[PDB]
Amino acid sequence: SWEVGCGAPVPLVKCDENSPYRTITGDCNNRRSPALGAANRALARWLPAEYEDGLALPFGWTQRKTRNGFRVPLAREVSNKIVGYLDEEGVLDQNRSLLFMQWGQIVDHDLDFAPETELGSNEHSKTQCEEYCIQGDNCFPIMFPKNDPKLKTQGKCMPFFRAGFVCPTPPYQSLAREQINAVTSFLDASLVYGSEPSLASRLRNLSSPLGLMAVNQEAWDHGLAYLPFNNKKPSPCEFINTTARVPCFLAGDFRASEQILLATAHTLLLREHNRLARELKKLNPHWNGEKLYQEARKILGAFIQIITFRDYLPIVLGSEMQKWIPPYQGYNNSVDPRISNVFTFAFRFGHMEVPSTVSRLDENYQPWGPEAELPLHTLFFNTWRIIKDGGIDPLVRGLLAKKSKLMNQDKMVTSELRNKLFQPTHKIHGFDLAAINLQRCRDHGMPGYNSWRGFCGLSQPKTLKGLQTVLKNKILAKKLMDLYKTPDNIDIWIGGNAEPMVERGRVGPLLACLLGRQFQQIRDGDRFWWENPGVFTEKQRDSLQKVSFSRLICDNTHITKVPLHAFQANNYPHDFVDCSTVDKLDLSPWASREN
Amino acid sequence: SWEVGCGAPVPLVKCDENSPYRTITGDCNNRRSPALGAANRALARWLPAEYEDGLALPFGWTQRKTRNGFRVPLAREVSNKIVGYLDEEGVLDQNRSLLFMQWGQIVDHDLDFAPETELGSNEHSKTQCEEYCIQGDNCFPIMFPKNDPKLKTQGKCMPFFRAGFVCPTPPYQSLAREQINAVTSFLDASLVYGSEPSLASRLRNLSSPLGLMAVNQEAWDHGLAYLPFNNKKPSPCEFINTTARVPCFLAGDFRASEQILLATAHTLLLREHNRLARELKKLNPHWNGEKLYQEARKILGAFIQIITFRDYLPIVLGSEMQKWIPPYQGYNNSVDPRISNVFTFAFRFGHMEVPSTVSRLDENYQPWGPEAELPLHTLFFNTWRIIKDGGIDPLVRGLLAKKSKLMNQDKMVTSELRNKLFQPTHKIHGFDLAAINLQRCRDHGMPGYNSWRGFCGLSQPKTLKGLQTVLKNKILAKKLMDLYKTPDNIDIWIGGNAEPMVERGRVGPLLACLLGRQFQQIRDGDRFWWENPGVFTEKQRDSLQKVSFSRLICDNTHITKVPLHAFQANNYPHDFVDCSTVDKLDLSPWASREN
Ligand code: HEM
Ligand code: HEM
Ligand SMILES: *[C@@H]1O[C@H](CO)[C@@H](O)[C@H](O)[C@H]1NC(C)=O
Ligand SMILES: *[C@@H]1O[C@H](CO)[C@@H](O)[C@H](O)[C@H]1NC(C)=O
Ligand SMILES: *[C@@H]1O[C@H](CO)[C@@H](O)[C@H](O)[C@H]1NC(C)=O
Ligand SMILES: *[C@@H]1O[C@H](CO)[C@@H](O)[C@H](O)[C@H]1NC(C)=O
Ligand SMILES: *[C@@H]1O[C@H](CO)[C@@H](O)[C@H](O)[C@H]1NC(C)=O
Ligand SMILES: *[C@@H]1O[C@H](CO)[C@@H](O)[C@H](O)[C@H]1NC(C)=O
Ligand SMILES: *[C@@H]1O[C@H](CO)[C@@H](O)[C@H](O)[C@H]1NC(C)=O
Ligand SMILES: *[C@@H]1O[C@H](CO)[C@@H](O)[C@H](O)[C@H]1NC(C)=O
Ligand SMILES: [Ca+2]
Ligand SMILES: [Ca+2]
Ligand SMILES: [Cl-]
Ligand SMILES: [Cl-]
């Protein structure tokens, strides 16, 4: 009767109990229960799934079954009516740089990924779905409402395919449907080294015995490396400028080339790794290839954990930081380290921090060349603007000296994402990130807004004026009640995101609780956390406290002037300093060709 | 391009190829390319892998994809109709003692291992495969055919898990699924010393500096030693008699105590190393433990190469010993030392040589005790009968004086193995080594029987009449044809073993060809061959050419009567002599004077 049985298609590897390095897939982190946290298992559930048929079909599937007696509004309709806006004057964040958002997306892609389903195989309805807008098995199209502009221009729907789910992957019931997390739940740089060993091998240079990651052999960036090319065909990156025909970048994470600043950051992280490998061959000429790669991999992971928890989270969570992430007390093999399903929608608050333009800047942080400012929608899956427009220096400069978009109850998500998103399988710049996220909620069986308030110890509004008081916004609350009829039906994504931000934070109270818990459970339940005594010698810890994003940029670009607190809003040159001023990671405590 | 980069599960540790000994891992034997021969590597392909989808899926996987236009028969069905027999009377080989059988297993176990995907640990893949028999991923269950008695007593299937494979390790498509050889390819005593360092270091006595192998403290064979126990749980050797609960032994090879006479041989080998170790300290009290360990290791290394090539191979290969293994013309460092994939199935000819019983014999070679002859299947993973019942001396005595089973086209595999094999994981003596072999050729993507005849320059029959003449057998040929429809589809393991033995040998021409080739590469491609110049002095070579299996028993048991050829049939006492006869291993040239 115990529900610890299901889970057929997945590896089952046995563990090295006293190995000092993480696995690639994440097995063997926990000893009593070793699959906890590993790639390619079911996402954790903090509250049971909720489906139209209690089983797998999403709310809004059958054009009749209500939800608690009310119909659910169209997802694109919720986008048009609440999420969009036209004017981009005055939307930026006066205290968060563009780096603030980009680190959010990079940490997201370390923690979770729920990919659409391989099925749609060598067949003929991955297109008829796209071509006739007919819901079918795993094709769940997003229908345009009346008067929606896209009707005059994109037919009747946007494509949408549901996310993959455990045990038999195309079957007959399976308790409630549960979606797969295809990466590791530990904050462990899976996005650099991969979460599957076929991929992790292919991403390394194993021809030499130096512990490096493979690098491209077609282009260079003033002698600094680029990611290798993912040569599989067809390429969404080649598709958007078939003249240039530059492929997408191959990295530890499937999403690396989705937008050019994300691809920019994947480069920094990979350059850093190789930088450690040849420094450690210097200090330790006797170390082999395996030793070098494993030991560099462990430093970049701590590097990522420290920046996340000391520089990023405090300015996300604000007044809720120490109430969810109190001081580390040591590893606790009872804590669940799995990412929750609901976490993979709470973290999509960043979609409202994405601004509508992206800049390249020159040595003095002035516009670089004639077209320094490009619209974001022309940079989805755009690699040729890296290779054939100056490499990554002008973009990293934009990350430091420009700004994130600010959350705003009357200007939620930029149209560059709300109408002009590009999706790699399809061909047009016509999609709606906002509608996707709302359709993904229901697909994942998310419980309503008020189930998660209750879950977070929060007041559960029932009326207009209750909602008006929670949202501190009477107009907005009126629109949502028109659309959903009861706060019990508000999809968690727009729900969590509609709440004003806590003090010195960048989310509201509901979302602060959700993310706060999850980051709690992923520090405390990881056997390889960096503070965990025994992972790193106490001398190594005191070197890793000096890490900075600023120093990361120094060591792996040709940028000589950077700020000291890269996450805040910094202007040139007042808040900029020289790159020998900043502090280095001192490798000497890693010298171990011991007697 | 030249993807010499795939092959993920690897370290490196570099080496010291100015070192006078072997490595445990087997790397650094070939200088141009150090990994040729190393543990944890892809098996070599003498012919390309052949699969349903040309990638990873075995023939027989999809009940709808023929091979050459016909469905492949079920493995258990072929085993029922071809390989079984009822009367063990008259089956014994009139001129091969039991040690001939045993010595084949010990050579095999040194050279190749391809463990089933050990990805099956506290997890319901094992039991989903066992109790529900549902194909999927690495579960490749052996379905029972129509009328199979085991239907009534064991269920629908026998469980089976596909062998491991390189770069990816759980997932799928490769240039071809290439399975792993988990031990060193060299005739090198890796079954005694182990093939990875972790295990290799644990088997050693590093509490004193005498260079000995850890020995068992709990029990002793009249003052002689036993292998140390294995305290990991659950213990299959405890399973088969919890009240006795004597655990399996822990040797340099996973499967050391799979049957009581295999464990026996292992105990002889340990006793020899430590013997050399303590007789080496005497000549050279100025030698450390590590020097004693290696030097003993090396001699034992030589002895295993001597017995195999001087005494075993001529009687297996017969009239084809010369054509495939001509006398030694020195190390050739462009010969591939690897074990091919097909060889691991070719060497399973020894399966048809395992008789139905095992004896114990007292000092006069008469039945020993109130239970002297025991059925084979009561002795899978049986160690209490070693340590609780007389020790090994009675068991050794049977090996000398009892006969091997002769191969036989109407009496191929005894039911002890064909119907009552014990598998470590499961609870029942009820598996089928025959069906596992045929199932395993398909896992390993083996080509058919006529692909392998051609490769050996043999005739490729297409007819009942051509297969009749090849097999010199009317009845057997038709039973193959009706099951396989075309000789091209006959799994190599049964086609090769179906052929009449060559004159003076114990395998047919196809096997003699695949066996002969490999052993030739095993000799010519090993930089550390006992007859390569510089390896051993010319003087030490004079010594080693007089070691004997008849000597090795005298030096490590309390047996005083051995025949001069322990490999042929010998009845007590007409063919037995007293140990004062059979020449020793004079260790004088191992005396290193200080001058
Ligand atoms: C294009 C996209 C972005 C930038 C140009 C972008 C940005 C972010 C940030 C900054 C995030 C967090 C701090 C973040 C979170 C998550 N996203 Fe998003 N995002 C872009 C585009 C997408 C697309 C397309 C998806 C797929 C949605 C679907 O269901 O098909 C997407 C998802 C996510 C996500 C969930 C990951 C998962 O487990 O599946 C986030 C946590 N983003 N994005
Ligand atoms: C060679 C050889 C192999 C394959 C080694 C490899 O994996 O590369 C082999 C295998 C086995 C197995 C596992 C088979 C599978 O699951 O695929 C079992 C359970 C088993 C049992 C016994 N064997 Fe064997 N065997 C090989 C060779 C030989 C030889 C060679 C001369 C003899 C003799 C022998 C004997 C026995 C045996 C005796 C009682 C048992 C039990 N094996 N083998
Ligand atoms: C592997 O390493 C060598 C340097 O040791 C380098 O020249 C080569 O280009 C690397 N290969 C790749 C694919 O990065
Ligand atoms: C395509 O790429 C080339 C660079 O090779 C660039 O010069 C050109 O302007 C690009 N065109 C478009 C439409 O993006
Ligand atoms: C470990 O986690 C559990 C579950 O949340 C908690 O009850 C317990 O207090 C924790 N233990 C320690 C020592 O912090
Ligand atoms: C920007 O944010 C940080 C942390 O929230 C804070 O220390 C700093 O004072 C803020 N700046 C302004 C102008 O509020
Ligand atoms: C047994 O066979 C071997 C095979 O080489 C042969 O040499 C021997 O003569 C045979 N037995 C006897 C007793 O001759
Ligand atoms: C190691 O060698 C010493 C020397 O006799 C012995 O006392 C000790 O028991 C040995 N240990 C093992 C495990 O063999
Ligand atoms: C268990 O072992 C004891 C001897 O140690 C023996 O008497 C008994 O028969 C064995 N039981 C079984 C079931 O083999
Ligand atoms: C050495 O082996 C190579 C392997 O290709 C083979 O060509 C040749 O016959 C052998 N020659 C010598 C001199 O060993
Ligand atoms: Ca991860
Ligand atoms: Ca070996
Ligand atoms: Cl602030
Ligand atoms: Cl003979």
3-state SS, B13-44, equals: CCCCCCCCCCCCCCCCCCCCCCCCCCCCEECE
Measured distance CA(B417)–CA(A505) in Å, rounded: 70
Give residues 179 to 238 of A whose Cβ lies within 8 Å of B: 196-198, 200-202, 205-207, 209
* Contact between B476 and B449 (Cβ < 8 Å): no
- Cα A450 to Cα A487, A491, B289, distances in angstroms: 7, 10, 72
Residues in chain B within 8 Å Cβ distance of A202:
5-6, 167
* Contact between A459 and A449 (Cβ < 8 Å): no
Measured distance CA(A418)–CA(A422) in Å, rounded: 10
Give bridge partners of residue A161 from the DSSP assignment.
Answer: A139
Compute the radius of gyration of chain B from its Cα atoms. Answer: 24
Q: Do B137 and A8 touch (CB under 8 A)?
A: yes
Measured distance CA(B265)–CA(B398) in Å, rounded: 12
What is the C-alpha end-to-end distance of chain A, expressed in Å? 56
Q: List the one residue out of B427, B441, B388 whose CA is nearest residue B79.
A: B441
Q: State the nearest Cα–Cα gap between A115 and chain B, in angstroms.
A: 17
Count the Cβ atoms, other than its own, within 10 Å of residue A171. Answer: 9
Q: Do A288 and B125 touch (CB under 8 A)?
A: no
Measured distance CA(A548)–CA(A312) in Å, rounded: 11
* Contact between B452 and B342 (Cβ < 8 Å): yes
The encoded tokens of residue A362 equal: 């020159």
Mutate to test the interface with A, among B1, B3, B53, B119 (most CBs of A within 10 A): B119
The encoded tokens of residue A228 equal: 């290798």
Q: List the one residue out of B171, B178, B176, B175 whose CA is nearest residue B40.
A: B178
Q: List the one residue out of B484, B498, B495 whose CA is nearest residue B453.
A: B495
Measured distance CA(A493)–CA(A508) in Å, rounded: 12
Q: Domains in chain A, ordered, with CATH? A: 1-595 (1.10.640.10)
What DSSP state is assigned to residue A160?
-
Residues in chain B within 8 Å Cβ distance of A201:
5-8, 167-168
* Contact between B543 and B381 (Cβ < 8 Å): no
Binding site, annotated residues of B: 105, 108-110, 114, 184, 186, 188, 190, 222, 255, 258, 348, 351, 440, 558
Amino acid at residue number A535 = V
Is residue B475 within 8 angstroms of chain A, CB to CB?
A: no
- φ/ψ region of A120 (left if φ > 0, alpha if ψ in -120 to 50, else beta) reads left
Taking the CA atoms of A281, A284, A288 and A289 in sequence, report the sign of the dihedral they define: negative
Q: Which of A215, A278, A293 to mutate to test the pocket of ligand 3 (most atoms within 8 A of CB)?
A: A215
Measured distance CA(B391)–CA(B267) in Å, rounded: 10
Amino acid at residue number A390 = G
Q: List the one residue out of B401, B366, B368, B399 whose CA is nearest residue B385.
A: B368
Q: Is A132 helix (H, G, I), strand (E, B) or coil?
A: helix
Q: Whose CA is nearest to atom 3 of ligand 4?
A: A244
Q: State the nearest Cα–Cα gap between B226 and chain A, in angstroms.
A: 27
User: Residue A573, preceding bond cis, omega within 30 degrees?
Assistant: yes
Residues in chain B within 8 Å Cβ distance of A122:
none
Q: State the nearest Cα–Cα gap between A12 and chain B, in angstroms.
A: 4
What is the C-alpha end-to-end distance of chain B, expressed in Å? 56
- What residues contact residue B407 under an 8 Å CB cut-off, 6+ apart? B349, B352, B353, B497, B501, B506
Identity of the residue in A8, A209, A289 whose CB atom sits nearest the CB atom of B128: A8
Strands (E) in A163-303, as ranges, are 180-181
Q: State the nearest Cα–Cα gap between A86 and chain B, in angstroms.
A: 47
Give bridge partners of residue A224 from the DSSP assignment.
Answer: A221
The encoded tokens of residue A416 equal: 């560059």
- What residues contact residue B353 under an 8 Å CB cut-off, 6+ apart? B93, B96, B100, B101, B104, B404, B405, B406, B407, B506
Give chain A's length.
595
Measured distance CA(B335)–CA(A365) in Å, rounded: 61
**Segment holding B415, helix H or strand E:** helix B415-418
Measured distance CA(A567)–CA(B523) in Å, rounded: 64
Residue bearing tokens 């999509």: A348
Give residues 240 to 299 of A whose Cβ lies within 8 Å of B: 286, 288-291
* Contact between B392 and B557 (Cβ < 8 Å): yes
Residue of B nearest to A209 (CA): B12
DSSP string of A103-145, one letter each residue: HHHHHHHHH---PBPS-S-SSSSTTHHHHH---BTTB--EEPP
Measured distance CA(A174)–CA(A177) in Å, rounded: 6
Shortest-distance atom of ligand 1 to CA A183: 38
Task: Please report the number of interchain residue pairs, chain A to chain B, with beta-carbon separation below 8 angstroms.
Answer: 76
Measured distance CA(B36)–CA(B57) in Å, rounded: 27
How many separate helices (H) and strands (E) can be counted in chain A?
A: 23, 12
Q: Cα-Cα-Cα-Cα dihedral of B332, B338, B344, B347, to 10°?
A: 20
Q: List the one residue out of B50, B79, B80 whose CA is nearest residue B452.
A: B50
Q: Is A244 helix (H, G, I), strand (E, B) or coil?
A: coil
Give chain B's length.
595
* Contact between B385 and B374 (Cβ < 8 Å): yes
Residue of B nearest to A5 (CA): B124
- What residues contact residue B346 under an 8 Å CB cut-off, 6+ apart? B492, B496, B511, B514, B515, B518
* Helix ranges, B363-410 (H): 384-387, 393-401
**Which phi and psi angles does B213 have, rounded to 5°?**
-85, 140
Residues in chain A within 8 Å Cβ distance of B177:
none
Is residue B137 within 8 angstroms of chain A, CB to CB?
A: yes
Measured distance CA(B266)–CA(A580) in Å, rounded: 64
Q: State the nearest Cα–Cα gap between B141 and chain A, in angstroms.
A: 15
Q: State the nearest Cα–Cα gap between B35 and chain A, in angstroms.
A: 12
- Ligand 1 site residues (CB inside 6 A) read A 101, 104-105, 108, 112-114, 258-259, 344, 347-348, 350-351, 354, 380, 433, 436, 440
Residue of B nearest to A205 (CA): B5
**Segment holding A291, helix H or strand E:** helix A289-306
Q: Is A367 helix (H, G, I), strand (E, B) or coil?
A: strand
Q: List the one residue out of A593, A574, A587 whose CA is nearest residue A279.
A: A587
- Cα A304 to Cα A188, A244, A502, A547, B48, distances in angstroms: 8, 34, 25, 10, 44
Measured distance CA(B339)–CA(A197) in Å, rounded: 25
CB of B19 closer than 6 angstroms to any ligand 10 atom: no
* Contact between B247 and B383 (Cβ < 8 Å): yes
According to DSSP, the β-strands at A403-405 and A421-422 are: unpaired
The encoded tokens of residue A537 equal: 């010698």
Identity of the residue in A8, A10, A288 whose CB atom sits nearest the CB atom of B13: A288
- What residues contact residue A285 under an 8 Å CB cut-off, 6+ apart? A593
The encoded tokens of residue A135 equal: 């819901």
Count the Cβ atoms, other than its own, within 10 Å of residue B232. Answer: 9
Q: Active-site residue numbers of B?
A: 109
Q: Which residues of A99-125 are buried (b: 16+ CB within 10 A; e: fewer)?
A: bbbbbbbbbbbbbbbbebbebbeeeeb
- Cα B134 to Cα A169, A378, B44, B292, distances in angstroms: 14, 49, 31, 53
Amino acid at residue number A161 = F
Binding site, annotated residues of B for Zn(2+): 222, 558
Identity of the residue in A12, A35, A201 whose CB atom sits nearest the CB atom of B8: A201
Amino acid at residue number A583 = D
Cα A243 to averaged position of ligand 4 atoms, centre (Å)? 7
Q: Do B125 and A200 touch (CB under 8 A)?
A: no
Provide the experimental method for this PDB entry: X-ray
What DSSP state is assigned to residue B445?
T
The encoded tokens of residue B366 equal: 């008469």
The encoded tokens of residue B206 equal: 């590093």
Q: Whose CA is nearest to atom 2 of ligand 7?
A: B95
Q: List the one residue out of B269, B268, B263, B195 whose CA is nearest residue B229.
A: B263
* Contact between B135 and B141 (Cβ < 8 Å): yes
Q: Whose CA is nearest to atom 14 of ligand 4?
A: A241
- φ/ψ region of B536 (left if φ > 0, alpha if ψ in -120 to 50, else beta) reads beta
Amino acid at residue number A566 = A
**Segment holding B562, helix H or strand E:** strand B561-562
Q: Whose CA is nearest to atom 2 of ligand 3?
A: A208
Compute the radius of gyration of chain A from its Cα atoms. Answer: 24
**Which phi and psi angles does B179 have, rounded to 5°?**
-70, 170
Give bridge partners of residue B357 from the DSSP assignment.
Answer: B375
The encoded tokens of residue A524 equal: 């405390």
Measured distance CA(A473)–CA(A470) in Å, rounded: 8
Give bridge partners of residue B375 from the DSSP assignment.
Answer: B357
The encoded tokens of residue B214 equal: 């850890």
**Segment holding A550, helix H or strand E:** helix A549-556
Q: Cα-Cα-Cα-Cα dihedral of A443, A444, A450, A454, to 10°?
A: 170
Measured distance CA(B65)–CA(B43) in Å, rounded: 26
Q: Which residues of A385-413 are buried (b: 16+ CB within 10 A; e: fewer)?
A: bbbebbbbbbbbbbbbbbbbbbbebebbb
Q: List the one residue out of B158, B185, B137, B187 whose CA is nearest residue B419.
A: B158
Q: List the one residue out of A378, A336, A342, A381 whose CA is nearest residue A360.
A: A378
Q: Do A12 and B137 touch (CB under 8 A)?
A: no
Measured distance CA(B166)–CA(B415) in Å, rounded: 35
- φ/ψ region of B307 (left if φ > 0, alpha if ψ in -120 to 50, else beta) reads alpha
Residues in chain A within 8 Å Cβ distance of B121:
12-14
Residue bearing tokens 């350059």: A271
Helix, strand, coil percent values for chain A (each to nearest 5):
35, 10, 55
**Which phi and psi angles does B551 have, rounded to 5°?**
-75, -45
How many separate helices (H) and strands (E) can be counted in chain B?
A: 23, 14
Measured distance CA(A570)–CA(A547) in Å, rounded: 19
Q: List the one residue out of A532, A528, A534, A536 whose CA is nearest residue A23.
A: A528
Residue B382's Cβ-count burial label (10 Å; 0-12, 13-18, 19+) is buried
What DSSP state is assigned to residue B587?
-
Taking the CA atoms of B494, B498, B504 and B506 in sequence, report the sign of the dihedral they define: positive
- What residues contact residue B158 under an 8 Å CB cut-off, 6+ apart? B76, B141, B142, B144, B150, B430, B431, B432, B435, B436
Residues in chain B within 8 Å Cβ distance of A200:
8
- What residues contact residue B507 under an 8 Å CB cut-off, 6+ apart? B316, B317, B349, B496, B497, B499, B501, B515
Residues in chain A within 8 Å Cβ distance of B171:
196, 198
Q: How far is CA B478 from the centre of its chain?
A: 31
Measured distance CA(B293)–CA(B277) in Å, rounded: 7
Is residue A120 within 8 angstroms of chain B, CB to CB?
A: no
The encoded tokens of residue B99 equal: 């040690």
Mutate to test the interface with B, among A3, A6, A10, A12 (most CBs of B within 10 A): A12
Binding site, annotated residues of B for heme b: 105, 108-109, 114, 255, 258, 348, 351, 440
Q: Do B120 and A12 touch (CB under 8 A)?
A: yes
Residue bearing tokens 């804590």: A335
Q: List the one residue out of A97, A383, A139, A123 whose CA is nearest residue A266.
A: A383
Q: Is B358 helix (H, G, I), strand (E, B) or coil?
A: strand
- Cα B216 to Cα A5, A265, B212, distances in angstroms: 40, 57, 12
Q: Cα-Cα-Cα-Cα dihedral of A45, A47, A52, A57, to 10°?
A: 0
**Which phi and psi angles does A151 have, rounded to 5°?**
-60, -45
Give bridge partners of residue B221 from the DSSP assignment.
Answer: B224
* Contact between A161 and A117 (Cβ < 8 Å): yes
Q: Is A316 helix (H, G, I), strand (E, B) or coil?
A: helix
* Contact between A549 and A387 (Cβ < 8 Å): no
The encoded tokens of residue A355 equal: 């601004």
Measured distance CA(A252)–CA(A192) in Å, rounded: 4
Identity of the residue in A6, A207, A209 whose CB atom sits nearest the CB atom of B5: A207
Measured distance CA(B567)–CA(B553) in Å, rounded: 13
Measured distance CA(A30)–CA(B351) in Å, rounded: 42
The encoded tokens of residue A422 equal: 């590009």
Q: Do A207 and B14 touch (CB under 8 A)?
A: no
Nearest ligand to the CA atom of B253: 12
Give bridge partners of residue A361 from the DSSP assignment.
Answer: A367
- Cα B198 to Cα A517, A539, B194, B214, distances in angstroms: 40, 28, 9, 14
Measured distance CA(A43)–CA(A36) in Å, rounded: 10
